[PDB]
């Protein structure tokens, strides 16, 4: 049952693109999941009650987020990134794992290929996924820039080396149950 | 309770290499970024550097780049740092802290009793 | 590398006295200021975090405020032990960067 090809995939996409994986029909030990993690939090079941269980399906979530935007990562969320990127039901059932990832995805130049999602018109559904980037109107209206009032959606986390930990690049997976 | 004690006072000879330890308990040794600070006697603090125990990652001061190197063993929750080419300057105290999330309330909380170096032939 | 600006690098007060200290930074650190005590003793505790948030068990005395680049550290009325180094420091980003520090000693 593959694992290794989610935690330790070379690259990851933005949270506003976050892609998913399907896993099912097999096992693996919980146990797997570590010094290597700095957050590992399951909701709706039990942290300890894990290899007890059976699921008819599970799926992982990879993205990545600064280290200050992780705590959106979790039921009841608000932010930007909990409210326009990705978002987890107050129901959710499974476990958010999270990690540094500084020395892979920061650059001393700095590295711009992650991005979110910051305007959007209606906060995202559970699970919900909005790839669209199209001119922003905060009037509701369909705009053409350089016209006034009318924004870009996206912005790029920049994922510098000299940057504290709260601003450094962290790595997400989600698994979700069933 | 937090705390990060540091190990004991050490005398040095000039040209010599000296290793020092900040252990961490009280919280997840690799979930925080841990710093040096160094302060020459009656002169002022300085940033030396840090590493990440979850990963051995790491940070230097430019300044200190070929003096100091940070290692870390995670089994017995422990940041060291290593101090070679030893000159008269080194001669000082030095202090581990830590940097977590959230960035802005998480760091600068807890410090080392700080380690005095001194060099002398 | 934010060069911080500390002032006055030496001060003489009495007990009782009300007294401000000032770091001006050279860019902007969004109120990623903290304020740290060094006794004599070589010890050393933190006081005010995020520019004006008092760190636990540290007396109502102390208070931190964020005036464009100017951050103060403030003590309503000076007390014995309070009498010491003061310094301030940027923890935005790397380098951390500390200002010159200040020696509190009583005055005659």
């Known amino acids: 049952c593959p694992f290794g090809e989610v935690f330790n995939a070379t690259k990851f996409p933005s949270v506003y693109a976050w892609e998913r994986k399907k896993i099912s029909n097999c096992v693996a030990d919980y146990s797997v999941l570590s010094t290597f993690f700095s957050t590992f939090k399951c909701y709706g079941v039990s942290a300890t009650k894990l290899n007890d269980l059976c699921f008819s399906n599970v799926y992982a979530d990879s993205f990545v987020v600064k280290g200050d935007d992780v705590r959106q990562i979790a039921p009841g969320q608000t932010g930007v990134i909990a409210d326009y990127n990705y978002k987890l039901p107050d129901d959710f059932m499974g476990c958010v794992l999270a990690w540094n990832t500084r020395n892979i995805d920061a650059t001393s130049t700095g590295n711009y290929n992650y991005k979110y999602r910051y305007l959007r018109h209606g906060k995202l559904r559970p699970f919900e996924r909005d790839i669209s980037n199209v001119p922003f109107s905060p009037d509701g209206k369909p705009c053409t820039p350089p016209a006034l009032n009318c924004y870009w959606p996206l912005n790029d986390y920049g994922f510098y080396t000299t940057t504290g930990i709260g601003y450094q690049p962290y790595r997400v997976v989600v698994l979700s149950f069933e | 309770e937090v705390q990060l004690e540091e190990s004991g006072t050490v005398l040095a000879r000039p040209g010599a290499s000296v290793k020092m330890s900040c252990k961490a308990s009280?919280?997840?040794?690799?979930?925080?970024?841990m710093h040096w600070i160094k302060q020459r006697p009656g002169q002022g603090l300085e940033w030396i550097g840090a590493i990440y125990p979850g990963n051995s990652d790491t940070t230097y001061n430019q300044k200190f780049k070929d003096k100091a190197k940070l290692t870390a063993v995670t089994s017995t929750s422990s940041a060291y740092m290593e101090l070679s080419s030893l000159t008269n300057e080194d001669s000082a105290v030095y202090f581990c802290?830590?940097?977590?999330?959230?960035?802005?309330?998480?760091?600068?909380?807890?410090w080392g009793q700080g380690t005095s170096v001194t060099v002398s032939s | 590398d934010i060069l911080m600006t500390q002032s006055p690098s030496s001060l003489s007060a009495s007990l009782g006295e009300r007294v401000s200290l000032t770091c001006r930074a050279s860019q902007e650190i969004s109120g990623y200021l903290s304020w740290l005590q060094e006794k004599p003793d070589g010890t050393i505790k933190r006081l005010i975090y995020?520019?004006?948030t008092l760190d636990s068990g540290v007396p109502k005395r102390f208070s931190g405020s964020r005036s464009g680049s100017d951050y103060s550290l403030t003590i309503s009325s000076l007390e014995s032990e309070d009498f010491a180094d003061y310094y301030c420091?940027?923890?935005?980003?790397?380098?951390?960067?500390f200002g010159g520090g200040t020696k509190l000693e009583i005055k005659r």
């Open positions: 420091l940027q923890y935005v980003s790397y380098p951390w960067t």
């Open positions: 802290t830590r940097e977590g999330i959230p960035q802005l309330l998480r760091t600068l909380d807890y």
């Open positions: 009280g919280y997840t040794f690799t979930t925080y970024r």
């Open positions: 995020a520019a004006s």
